[PDB]
Paper text:
PfRH5 is the best understood component of PfPCRCR and interacts with human membrane protein complexes containing the erythrocyte receptor basigin. Antibodies which target PfRH5 are highly effective at preventing erythrocyte invasion and the most potent growth-inhibitory antibodies bind a single epitope. Here we use structure-guided approaches to design a small synthetic immunogen, RH5-34EM which recapitulates this epitope. Structural biology and biophysics demonstrate that RH5-34EM is correctly folded and binds neutralising monoclonal antibodies with nanomolar affinity.
We selected design 3A to progress to detailed characterisation and provisionally called this RH5-34EM, according to our hypothesis that it is an excellent mimic of the R5.034 epitope. We conducted circular dichroism analysis at increasing temperatures and show that secondary structure content is retained up to 90 °C, compared with a melting temperature of ~65 °C for our previous thermally stabilised PfRH5_HS1 design, now also called RH5.2. However, R5.034 showed a very similar high affinity and binding kinetics for both RH5-34EM and PfRH5 (73 pM vs 94 pM). Therefore, RH5-34EM effectively mimics the epitope of the most effective growth-inhibitory human antibody, R5.034 and substantially mimics that of R5.016. We next determined crystal structures of the RH5-34EM epitope mimic bound to scFv fragments of human monoclonal antibodies R5.016 (at 1.63 Å resolution) and R5.034 (at 1.75 Å resolution). Comparison of these structures with those of PfRH5 bound to R5.016 and R5.034 showed significant similarity, both in the fold of the epitope mimic and in the interactions that it makes with antibodies. In the case of R5.034, of the 10 interactions made with PfRH5, 9 were also observed with the epitope mimic. These structural alignments also confirmed that RH5-34EM more correctly recapitulates the epitope for R5.034 than that for R5.016, with R5.034 binding closer to the centre of the RH5-34EM immunogen, while R5.016 binds more towards the tip of the immunogen, where the structural similarity to PfRH5 starts to diverge. Production of our focused immunogen involved grafting the 9AD4/R5.016/R5.034 epitope onto a small scaffold protein and redesigning the resultant molecule to ensure that it folds correctly. This was successful, with structural studies showing that both R5.016 and R5.034 bind to the synthetic immunogen with the expected binding mode. Surface plasmon resonance analysis confirmed the formation of the correct epitope, with all three antibodies binding with at least nanomolar affinity, albeit showing that the immunogen most effectively recapitulated the R5.034 epitope.
Author numbering:
A (entry chain A): 1 to 119, 137 to 245
B (entry chain B): 5 to 80, 87 to 118
């Protein structure tokens, strides 16, 4: 069973340190890039870091550089996030994620998240709606440094659940995901089309891509889909 | 730096190669366990081809941009790098074709 289990969450003072861990099972952990993505309460997704199979490369969100360290121990099938110099902006649920294909920068497996309490580049429409069996489209507007040059991923997040990868490499559908979800990319904008709408499709949808200028993954602000 | 361009290109090709290797590893499990219907075999062949086309495009882009980046830098060892990047991409393209050849055999 492909699974990621985070632990180590807690309440920390500003300026403090906290170490998160993630136990992986059901796959050859040593052959995959791994990542952390966070979500502040009631807010959108924000990527934190990636780490190559053996720790030869690390990628970070600019605002956590000099504060956070991603690391892994392949013998223990564990991914870690050492968080120092903590700030109020770091309060969030932190998800452990598998980055596969790493060349598409796609998070194809997500953990349930570990809660941490310290106490814009991609534009999406805030809301979309339509009746059952009908279709909606969700835009994701970017620039040449992200969508223009890099593969787009789309995620679905149901209430109280971890995000799920739907589309990666701009238009490939994740195995098991219905073919009524389709992705497209033209120029510096991307689109997710959902046809055959069902009541279970009601969720927040997020686009993401690597950004060459920011040197990291950028997420859209998310779109709330309502089924009439 | 031309040496940095070369190293980053080789690292990106290794990343794409590991993606193709993990894809094939997961595909071995998927094909062997699935109900191999006429519709399933038609659909899975298309899905595999679509995935391997994305990987081939990614590797082609790495080699194309590295060659271009080096050509501009020499207007400011280099040809050795050009050859190794071309070699890595060629080897990666043979690997991708071999995954597709084996997938077509597991489906039939």
């Amino acid at each position: 069973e492909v699974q990621l289990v985070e632990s180590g969450g807690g309440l920390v003072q500003p300026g403090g340190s906290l170490r998160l861990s993630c136990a992986a099972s059901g796959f050859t952990f040593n052959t995959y890039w791994m990542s952390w993505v966070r979500q502040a309460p009631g807010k959108g997704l924000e990527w934190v870091a990636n780490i190559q199979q053996d720790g030869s490369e690390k990628d970070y969100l600019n605002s956590v550089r000099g504060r956070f360290t991603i690391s892994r121990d392949n013998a223990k099938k564990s991914l870690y996030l050492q968080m120092n110099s903590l700030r109020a902006e770091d309060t969030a649920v932190y998800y452990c994620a598998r980055d596969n294909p790493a060349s598409a920068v796609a998070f194809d497996v997500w953990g349930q998240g570990a809660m941490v309490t310290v106490s814009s580049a991609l534009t999406q429409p805030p809301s979309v709606s339509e009746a059952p069996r009908r279709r909606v489209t969700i835009y994701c507007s970017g620039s040449s440094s992200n969508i223009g040059n890099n593969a787009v991923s789309w995620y679905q997040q149901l209430p109280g659940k971890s995000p799920k990868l739907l589309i990666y490499f701009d238009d490939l559908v994740t195995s098991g995901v219905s073919d009524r979800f389709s992705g497209s990319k033209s120029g510096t904008s991307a689109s997710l089309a959902i046809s055959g709408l069902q009541s279970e499709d009601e969720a927040d949808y997020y686009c993401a891509a690597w950004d060459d200028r920011l040197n990291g993954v950028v997420f859209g602000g998310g779109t709330k889909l309502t089924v009439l | 730096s031309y040496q940095d361009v070369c190293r980053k290109a080789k690292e990106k090709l290794d990343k794409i190669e590991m993606d193709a290797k993990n894809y094939e590893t997961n595909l071995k499990e998927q094909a062997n366990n699935a109900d191999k219907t006429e519709e399933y075999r038609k659909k899975k062949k298309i899905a595999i081809e679509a995935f391997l086309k994305k990987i081939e495009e990614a590797a082609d882009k790495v080699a194309r941009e590295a060659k271009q980046r080096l050509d501009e830098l020499e207007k400011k060892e280099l040809e050795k790098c050009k050859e190794e990047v071309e070699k890595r991409a060629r080897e990666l393209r043979r690997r991708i074709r071999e995954i597709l050849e084996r997938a077509k055999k597991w489906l039939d």
